[PDB]
Design an enzyme around this catalytic site. Structure first.
Site, PDB file in Angstrom:
ATOM      1  N   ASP A  43       0.849  -1.194   0.000  1.00 22.58           N
ATOM      2  CA  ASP A  43       0.000   0.000   0.000  1.00 22.58           C
ATOM      3  C   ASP A  43       0.882   1.240   0.000  1.00 22.58           C
ATOM      4  OD1 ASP A  43      -2.370   1.565   0.070  1.00 22.58           O
ATOM      5  OD2 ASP A  43      -2.400   1.527   2.273  1.00 22.58           O
ATOM      6  N   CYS A  44       1.621   1.389  -1.089  1.00 20.38           N
ATOM      7  CA  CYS A  44       2.668   2.389  -1.215  1.00 20.38           C
ATOM      8  C   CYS A  44       2.728   2.912  -2.657  1.00 20.38           C
ATOM      9  CB  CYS A  44       3.959   1.668  -0.840  1.00 20.38           C
ATOM     10  SG  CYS A  44       5.401   2.424  -1.208  1.00 20.38           S
TER      11      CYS A  44
END
EC number: 1.11.1.9
Length: 174
Positions: A43-44
């Protein structure tokens, strides 16, 4: 110091780590291989480009003489919130990667995973975000690191050069 106690831990491949299912695994199975060790996150901003790039490198140079060894970590912008088994399925589902995705670890602080702290202590570089990269030679020594902003085009030449030497050595030496 004491000479007797200098250089007690010399190889990244000497360590045990947990796999994504929570089972203890020895990194001795990667002895004799070149490894690119990377802290990952799902989640980057950098997630997509890194999984794609790491997949390409592993496909080209692996799996006999090279592996990507991926260690998820939630300490950089809380970018790996899901359980370890879900992280592994994320990578497989969305990217079809076949390189190992290990159990989520801590890297920063007192509880930092010993295997990853070896990388930090060897290179003198602690990750400051997701997707720092460490090149580990067949002997388990860290010989290079890259920050997350470095593209695959500047990583690939070192991998190719090290993998070439491994292939020659496996052929020539008994």
């Amino acid at each position: 110091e004491n000479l007797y106690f200098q250089s007690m831990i010399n190889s990244f491949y000497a360590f045990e780590v947990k796999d994504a299912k929570g089972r203890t695994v020895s990194l001795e199975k990667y002895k004799g291989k070149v490894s690119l060790v990377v802290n990952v996150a799902s989640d980057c901003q950098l997630t997509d480009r890194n999984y794609l790039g790491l997949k390409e490198l592993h496909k080209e140079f692996g799996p006999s003489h090279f592996s990507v060894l991926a260690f998820p970590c939630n300490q950089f912008g809380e970018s790996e919130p899901r359980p370890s088994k879900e992280v592994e399925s994320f990578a497989r589902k969305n990217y079809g990667v076949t390189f190992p995705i290990f159990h989520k670890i801590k890297i920063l602080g007192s509880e930092g995973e010993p295997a990853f702290r070896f990388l930090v202590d060897s290179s003198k570089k602690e990750p400051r975000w997701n997707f720092w990269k460490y090149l580990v030679n067949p002997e388990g020594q860290v010989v290079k690191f890259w920050r997350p902003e470095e593209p695959i085009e500047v990583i690939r030449p070192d991998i190719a050069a090290l993998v070439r030497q491994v292939i020659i050595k496996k052929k020539e030496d008994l």
